[PDB]
Write a protein that binds this ligand. Sequence first.
Ligand SMILES: N[C@@H](CCC(=O)N[C@@H](CS)C(=O)NCC(=O)O)C(=O)O
Ligand SMILES: N[C@@H](CCC(=O)N[C@@H](CS)C(=O)NCC(=O)O)C(=O)O
Lengths: 587, 587
Amino acid sequence: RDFGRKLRLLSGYLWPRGSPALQLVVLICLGLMGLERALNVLVPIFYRNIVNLLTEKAPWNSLAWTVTSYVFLKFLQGGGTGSTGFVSNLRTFLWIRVQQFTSRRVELLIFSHLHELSLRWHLGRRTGEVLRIADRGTSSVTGLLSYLVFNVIPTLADIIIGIIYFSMFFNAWFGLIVFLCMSLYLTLTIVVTEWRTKFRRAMNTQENATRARAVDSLLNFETVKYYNAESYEVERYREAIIKYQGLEWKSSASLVLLNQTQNLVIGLGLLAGSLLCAYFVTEQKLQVGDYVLFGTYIIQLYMPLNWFGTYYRMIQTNFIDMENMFDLLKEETEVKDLPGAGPLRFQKGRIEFENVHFSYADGRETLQDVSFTVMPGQTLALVGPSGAGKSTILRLLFRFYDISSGCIRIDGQDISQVTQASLRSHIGVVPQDTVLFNDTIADNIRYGRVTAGNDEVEAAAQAAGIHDAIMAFPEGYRTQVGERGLKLSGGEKQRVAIARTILKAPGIILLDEATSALDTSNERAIQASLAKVCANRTTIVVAHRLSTVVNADQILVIKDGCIVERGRHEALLSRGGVYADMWQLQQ
Amino acid sequence: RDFGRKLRLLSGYLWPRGSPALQLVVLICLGLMGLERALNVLVPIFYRNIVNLLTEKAPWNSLAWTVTSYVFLKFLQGGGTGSTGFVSNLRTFLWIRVQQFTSRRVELLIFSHLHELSLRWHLGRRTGEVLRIADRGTSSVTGLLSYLVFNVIPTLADIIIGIIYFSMFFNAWFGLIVFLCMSLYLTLTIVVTEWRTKFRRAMNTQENATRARAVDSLLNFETVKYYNAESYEVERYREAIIKYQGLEWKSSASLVLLNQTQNLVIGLGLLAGSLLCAYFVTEQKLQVGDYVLFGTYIIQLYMPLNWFGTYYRMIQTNFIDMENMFDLLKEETEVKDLPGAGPLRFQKGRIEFENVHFSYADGRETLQDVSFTVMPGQTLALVGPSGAGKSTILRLLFRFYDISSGCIRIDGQDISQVTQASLRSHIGVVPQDTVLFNDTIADNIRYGRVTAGNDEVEAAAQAAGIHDAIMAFPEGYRTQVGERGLKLSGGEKQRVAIARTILKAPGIILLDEATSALDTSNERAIQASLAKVCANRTTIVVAHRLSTVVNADQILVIKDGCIVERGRHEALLSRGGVYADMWQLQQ
Ligand SMILES: N[C@@H](CCC(=O)N[C@@H](CS)C(=O)NCC(=O)O)C(=O)O
Ligand SMILES: N[C@@H](CCC(=O)N[C@@H](CS)C(=O)NCC(=O)O)C(=O)O
């Protein structure tokens, strides 16, 4: 039933293909499992020997030695519920290390491969669902291995070994009795389990619904604002509670029924076995100790079978979760890749366009036959209505999609024939809302270059005029910054964005202006700093204000993928066309 | 150790003081617990009888009947791990019903009392934390009762009963042996359960930190935007994983030690008992069956005492959660309430203000000596800068806070000592951002009156001009609406707000103008509807546009708690004051 490939993948993930100091640990763990399985069978034999020696008035010495050996063996073996003895504890003590190793490896792998994807897929689904999928996937990879290997194979092996022992060394009917009892136990526990899976899921769905209902009567506090509607909400909560309680009652009972069907089957068992053994004993066919041996063996072999239910249920789920996570990882639809080879030669920073058409969505087209060429060092600007074309062309400048038709070349070299690393390193981008994550300002600034020391940080503090503002803070570089720490203003995060821009030392500045209201002096200082970092550097600015455009060397207007102005600035001044639009935009 | 009052409260919650059909259930459950405890002691006596009868070659009939009785008894008693037998399953089968009843009652109580609170407390902390506190509180109330009553008292009772039995009917030294073994087991379990507690909490904190770290590398997709910072994020994740794995390893190692300290104190005890019993057997002081009897009793005590060991931590945690939930319920910070008695009768709706002072924050004061009086049917309006005073006075019209100093009267009756029910019933309020929860629009409309039938819904749909939209939707009143369903426009939700306003049919309309830009024809239709619902009804409107002011009878301007305009509409037009502000607002 397609289990072959599944088990092959599980085996692949089991063996630590890496460090050679862990295969020895795995071998030791398997040997310990084998020793535990042997002890589990050979303890009752010593119990029977003790009883037999006691019933024939043996001398004290042999009795003492045998009882000491039996007690030591019981201590080594699981002295109850399987998972108590010394052997199982050592097995856990090594498997924790091996499990941590494998979980770390798989988690790093999935994290890196998920981070390697493109943007469209990352906007396709929300982050919470995918993070939950990943966490459940790694938890399943560990737990399914643990559950199967160390709780479902040992139990079946114990069952088979006990059947063989009873059929060979004890009699010919006890084997049949045990086999029938265990077969009935297994099949009944399996079915009952499916019926219960049904009535249960329905309980989890109802619980999720009744929990979601509760939130929207505490997060939507308009009840009193509208009317005296406390009674209505109370009644609705009562009805939801009633439904959930009914489903819960049905579930819990299924469990009581699985539990008792089991406690019966094992019992019809004991009876049959105990009655037959007693009858065989009373006619000198067996010994006294055989009775206690059979009782102890049946009890001890039934002991780890009490959870087969939970185990079926889970070994299933975790398989579904593994399917989901492997489907996530196996996806190869990440079409933003690179050619076979070819670095980038950033000679001077030439940018050219040749009738490029692109539409980020489907159905209709937004950008078509856009063509313009910018001399290096000139601060070209883009203006237009409230549209998404500006952001689109911003992204195609940054190799964030794949152009459907056209060509984008830089310095006489196509950007589609080079790796993303150099092209993205040479360009610094300032977004509208520069949001930062939870860390100190020191690593925030060093985020520009990992190998750059604090010398570049001091240089940036001197250059960007942030030294006085930074040292004004009494907490120093170890200040708690972010949503966890203190809040900052928009101007401050723009300033730190310029700081990391100077850290980058880029070749092109594809900056986007923020729309924050501020005094003209601070904005002019910011623009002066931007000019002094983009001096003798290509610059593209997107804004709705003419202050940055009046001194700009070239201005373009985009109207649904159309450009109607070109040439030098004096030509546009002499046009006298939408210059009315510029006049009415100036005020 | 302060346990007395806590146990008294637990006893209070245990007995269902309500319906008379559950006292019988509780009595039956306690009787079943007692019967289980008796069986758990009296089974090994039958085992010893069987062995003794087998060793003296008893006749077959007595042996068969005794063995059948013993097997039946084992089936009735827990045939392993305590929670398997028929008796325990029946106890669960009734406790599920009683637990559902008590949980439902406590949850409804806490929900209603929490919903009765005021607003400032609800802005003191977010809803998620308080809801999680409530849910943990109810879960603890159920689980702590279950854990204690049915798994910590029975085990200690079993220990004491076994000690008594061994000291009385068996010998004078087995009691000492068992007592010493059990005392050592308990004390070692307690101490190792504490040291491990520490190391562990540290594991939970580290896990929470690492998990929270992952979300801020997927909700902050700026890595590609800034620079090739995949390596830095991968390294940071690796370091966090390393720290978490170290803490996890320490915790697992601690667990492996508690387990074995136990499996020893049990091994030492069993060794001593078995050796002494065998030596006493070899000198004809005891019987053969006493050996198997002693062996079979220790195993029982051990199962339960194992999981006992664990249950310490949980009783402790929960008692913390119960303390938190009871502290939440005992909170009395609801200062917006009503005097000892006094209903309200609304005649016509006179409103007067006599130099009232109010400050919702602390330190400074915002609203002071505010005085105005509104004739019925006059749409009095407030205007000013970007300030919250307008919303504040909107709130004080609704008895949403307590006036610091002054006098507020409606219809010549002070509102500070009247019931909130009628006072909020006679007044309808239209907010700016009307948020609704997950349900159909039919209930959204019916929200006006719980007792109102569909006849009023049809009449209001005809009156408010919303029937055409209803017929437009092919799903009718049964359309799936809300954030889970399809979205609606701002104009539509304002319209449904007016619809529920007509459902209320109030006497005073403390409406607030919507801040949505829309076609002037729809706005004039909305204004006509508002006039036709506010005809011969008092109205107060807050807006920054002159559309609601041109026809207004009286307009007030707030200047950080100052009012300088008063009089009739012609009077304020002729005053020649902030009329300049009116002209400069128009264009
Ligand atoms: N009756 C189950 C016992 C399994 C069990 O009780 N384990 C706990 C989990 S720690 C459980 O299942 N209780 C909650 C549930 O019903 O799922 C079986 O025989 O497999
Ligand atoms: N040897 C453990 C057995 C109990 C146990 O391990 N139970 C599970 C809970 S189902 C557990 O504790 N695992 C998580 C943990 O280590 O706390 C003890 O004596 O406490």
